[PDB]
């Protein structure tokens, strides 16, 4: 039935109509979190894509239907179930892994066993 | 004078005020004027991504991680979270988007 985002999906989401964006079309984004979480919560963690690279270090090039780069440090929770999401494609495994690898530098944890 | 720069583990108040826990390292926070943080809310509901901050007055919502322009917004320092609480927040995020777990799904 309804599409449910899964990790690696390249989705389109609406520009939030309250935030004043002057951009045309939709906002592309890469889904990071797994299907099971996304399905259960109606949310997903994603990074946004832009058409213009600028050479910043958290940029990950996406090769593959529209040119783009994912901004790996700009992770956000997206309410796909309430606000909508459309699947346009999937990113390469290497690109998905690179995005997650970069994010780890911002959320690196300690190396020990614990309850979580 | 010289504005406060968030460090990893700091509990900050951000003009959105909204409390948040800063996850990203000082080096990143200082260079970019951005930080990766998690917002806090007033009450717990038993949602699994909640992390209760001890002990007065602090419930962090781990799955609502967000990059915030602390420098432009004007963040202030409320204190620092206990190491165990910081670790728990990070671990819960890691389950969802960590490279180590990625390979258990694909």
């Amino acid at each position: 039935s309804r599409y449910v985002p899964d990790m690696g999906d390249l989705i389109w989401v609406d520009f939030d109509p309250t935030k004043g964006s002057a951009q045309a079309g939709h906002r592309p984004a890469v889904v990071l979190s797994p299907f099971m979480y996304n399905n259960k919560t109606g949310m997903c963690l994603c990074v946004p894509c832009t058409t213009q690279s600028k050479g910043y270090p958290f940029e990950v090039v996406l090769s593959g239907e529209r040119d783009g780069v994912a901004l790996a440090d700009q992770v956000k929770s997206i309410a796909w179930r309430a606000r909508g999401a459309t699947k346009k494609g999937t990113v390469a495994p290497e690109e998905l892994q690179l995005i997650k690898a970069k994010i780890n530098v911002l959320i690196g944890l300690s190396h020990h066993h614990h309850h979580h | 004078v010289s504005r406060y720069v968030p460090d990893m583990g700091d509990l900050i108040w951000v003009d959105f005020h909204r409390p948040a826990v800063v996850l990203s390292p000082f080096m990143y926070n200082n260079k970019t004027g951005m930080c990766l943080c998690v917002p806090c809310t007033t009450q717990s509901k038993g949602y699994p991504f909640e992390v209760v901050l001890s002990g007065q007055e602090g419930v962090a919502l781990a799955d609502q991680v967000k990059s915030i322009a602390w420098r432009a917004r004007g963040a202030t320092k409320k204190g620092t979270v206990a190491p165990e609480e910081l670790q728990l927040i990070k671990a819960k995020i890691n389950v969802l988007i960590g490279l180590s777990h990625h390979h258990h799904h694909h």
């Binding site: 935030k19 956000k76 309410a79 | 970019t32 809310t41 609502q64 915030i68 432009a72």
Partner: peptide, 15 residues
Amino acid sequence: HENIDWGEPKDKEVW
């Protein structure tokens, strides 16, 4: 919990 809303994006926040 509400989906936390940070209001108008600022500085280098893209969304």
